């Protein structure tokens, strides 16, 4: 009933990302995804947002939410790359020893599992059978990653429309 209204908007913005990879989203456009009474598992279907937040929630929120948002900012770019009309050269390969990754994403519990959602299944890299990334899935994960980074930033600045429910994590 009301979960459908969320999914429609969720899909409509996912489609937007597939058309334009560098498409930017305001808080005005993200509104129906932010002000929905749904729980976390019903709003993040691919991303395990609950585990990403609570398993890195040690210390001060002003510090772990920024470490978390920093990782989500890179993960979103990992997605936008696969969606670009021309994809980067070494797109199918992600090395742990890589500077940007280990310094950012691999500093967060569950950062790797997000890449597996993108398509990097064989252990990270794409399987040989996969010659090109799934345009629908990536855009969906990228949207959820972007959505989570957005929610955390509204948490850090105490403006989230459901701030008095998310702080239970």
């Amino acid at each position: 009933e009301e979960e459908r209204a969320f999914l429609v908007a969720r899909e409509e913005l996912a489609s937007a990302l597939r058309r334009d990879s560098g498409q930017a989203f305001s808080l005005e456009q993200l509104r129906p995804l932010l002000a929905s009474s749904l729980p976390l598992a019903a709003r993040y279907l691919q991303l395990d947002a609950a585990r990403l937040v609570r398993c890195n929630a040690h210390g001060e929120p002003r510090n772990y939410l920024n470490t978390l948002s920093t990782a989500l900012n890179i993960l979103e770019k990992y997605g936008r790359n696969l969606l670009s009309p021309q994809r980067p050269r070494y797109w199918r390969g992600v090395k742990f020893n890589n500077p940007v990754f280990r310094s950012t994403v691999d500093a967060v519990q569950g950062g790797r599992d997000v890449l597996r959602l993108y398509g990097y299944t064989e252990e990270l890299s794409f399987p040989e059978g996969q010659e090109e990334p799934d345009e629908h899935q990536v855009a969906t994960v990228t949207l959820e990653v972007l959505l989570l980074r957005t929610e955390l930033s509204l948490l850090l600045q105490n403006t989230h429309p459901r701030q008095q429910a998310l702080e239970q994590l």
Binding site: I74, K77, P88, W91, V94, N98, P99
Partner: peptide, 4 residues
């Protein structure tokens, strides 16, 4: 950068 992000792949190396």
């Amino acid at each position: 950068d992000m792949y190396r």
